[PDB]
Design a protein around this ligand. Structure first.
Ligand SMILES: CCCCCCCCCCCCO[C@H]1O[C@H](CO)[C@@H](O[C@H]2O[C@H](CO)[C@@H](O)[C@H](O)[C@H]2O)[C@H](O)[C@H]1O
Ligand SMILES: CC1=C(/C=C/C(C)=C\C=C\C(C)=C\C(=O)O)C(C)(C)CCC1
Ligand SMILES: [Cl-]
Length: 236
């Protein structure tokens, strides 16, 4: 045991909780927009969804800047990491707020959309794969600390193309991996496969995000103007 590792766990947990409202703390609310049938795109829903996405991108940057050592990387490397991982983290975030009984996902302001509305907001042919990912995330029963640490591990990764100092990024990731294993095993000692299961979710997350990037291309043709600039920074 080391005090430094325990401090890292709590720092990351706090950074996550303070940039990602929990489903339980949110005042959920609904919309009646295009709620029953799948359409190509409901522009009202796209407007609301894309605005929320911009806000969450800013929150993910805020989260990143609170991760120990992140701001010690070159600005170029910080941007490179954020561009590489933002969509992964957005996916993890929305899927964490999945309510299976109601077949809904809840955004950071409490906006709660059913599957059809998620489709109509822009997810389109990606919707059911996203819900399937959320469904397969559930049994892991991850808590906020674990979700925070996993998000940090997804972001701080030395394999990203065009990194100036990949070995430096590698070194920053090391304690995050150690922290997640220590925490996961302590919390649920009778479920020792939880750590490796969590790590394998990273690969699943990358897979769904690649599909997300593909969806963005087709979505660009359906929208009446360009996507919001921070969304373009994430995708383009
Ligand atoms: C994925 C690609 C990544 C590319 C890197 C982009 C990093 C840019 C992040 C913005 C950094 C500056 O952030 C600073 O100004 C932003 C714009 O006024 C604010 O951004 C936002 O803040 C509020 C709460 O987060 C939001 O409800 C508002 O939409 C907006 O004002 C930040 O609260 C502020 O701390
Ligand atoms: C942004 C964006 C996309 C993905 C959004 C995802 C995957 C999650 C959004 C999460 C939010 C916005 C959570 C919150 O508010 O807590 C897709 C690929 C559809 C293409 C259009 C732009
Ligand atoms: Cl570009």
């Amino acid at each position: 045991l080391s005090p430094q590792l325990e401090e890292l766990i709590t720092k990351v947990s706090k950074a996550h909780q303070e940039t990602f409202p929990s489903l339980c703390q949110l005042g959920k609310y609904t919309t009646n927009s295009s709620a029953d049938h799948r359409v190509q795109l409901d522009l009202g829903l796209w407007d609301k969804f894309s605005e929320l996405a911009t806000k969450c991108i800013i929150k993910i940057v805020e989260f990143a800047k609170r991760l120990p050592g992140f701001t010690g990387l070159s600005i170029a490397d910080q941007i490179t990491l954020l561009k590489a991982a933002c969509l992964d983290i957005l996916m993890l975030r929305i899927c964490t707020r999945y309510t299976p009984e109601q077949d809904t996902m809840t955004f950071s302001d409490g906006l709660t959309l059913n599957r059809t509305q998620m489709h109509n907001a822009g997810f389109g042919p990606l919707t059911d794969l996203v819900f399937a990912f959320a469904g397969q995330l559930l049994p892991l029963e991850m808590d906020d600390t674990e979700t925070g640490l996993l998000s940090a591990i997804c972001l701080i990764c030395g394999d990203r193309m065009d990194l100036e100092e990949p070995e430096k990024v590698d070194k920053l990731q090391e304690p995050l991996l150690e922290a997640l294993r220590l925490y996961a095993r302590r919390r649920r000692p009778e479920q020792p496969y939880m750590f490796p299961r969590m790590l394998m979710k990273i690969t699943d997350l990358r897979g769904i995000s690649t599909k997300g990037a593909e969806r963005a291309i087709t979505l660009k043709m359906e929208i009446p103007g360009p996507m919001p600039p921070l969304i373009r920074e994430m995708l383009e």
